[PDB]
Amino acid sequence: EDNNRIISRLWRSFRTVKEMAADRGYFISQEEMDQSLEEFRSKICDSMGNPQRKLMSFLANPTPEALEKYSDLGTLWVEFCDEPSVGIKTMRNFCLRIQEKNFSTGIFIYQNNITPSANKMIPTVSPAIIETFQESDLVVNITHHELVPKHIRLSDGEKSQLLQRYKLKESQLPRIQREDPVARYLGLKRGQVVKIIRRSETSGRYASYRICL
């Protein structure tokens, strides 16, 4: 019934969130990655079948490779919201939780909608970063699409090397929007550069670069 498809969509969203966390540098165990649907229903759903979003929250730490490559990578806290509509109360509570439990970045997945007050409170949570995603747009992982090539964020040294090699200013590079779906998937901040290796029918392979806004 509709409960089964709700559970399936929630499981797909959870898998996409785990894949996103793994792609940004954090470590997620392979058993957790291939955690099947039946195990999800066993671990989350109760006797009547309703799911508890509060049981899906987890923590992550960067791999040594990612920590060496990116030095601004802290601890990640992902939390799903039971409340369909997220008010200023819930956003403030989440901000308080992040501030007290010293996390570098916190991802907050909501179900239906977020109030404008909460959005206006998002930028004032510095130095911690809060990012908001909707449940519906996380069902399918867009980075697995055939039309989406692989994006790789560059380190500060690599960005400096690129700018020196091409003798460019930052404003002279191709741009990518902050609200771009792939930019939001990678958690791009303003001033960061991604390397995009792409298929080419004239040379086989072609590496392009874009700078976030």
């Binding site: 165990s29 509060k54 049981l55 987890f58 923590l59």
Partner: protein, 40 residues
């Protein structure tokens, strides 16, 4: 046979790294579960 031996050595090293990372991950899993129990 030398190439096979080198491949086995690399697989064993990767397995050891994966085991260490799993050991590190289990502590985070336990802490997250405890904090979610506290939230309830």
């Amino acid at each position: 046979e030398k190439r096979l031996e080198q491949e086995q050595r690399r697989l064993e090293e990767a397995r050891k790294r994966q085991e260490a990372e799993l050991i590190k991950r289990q502590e985070l899993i336990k802490q997250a579960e405890e904090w979610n129990k506290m939230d309830i």
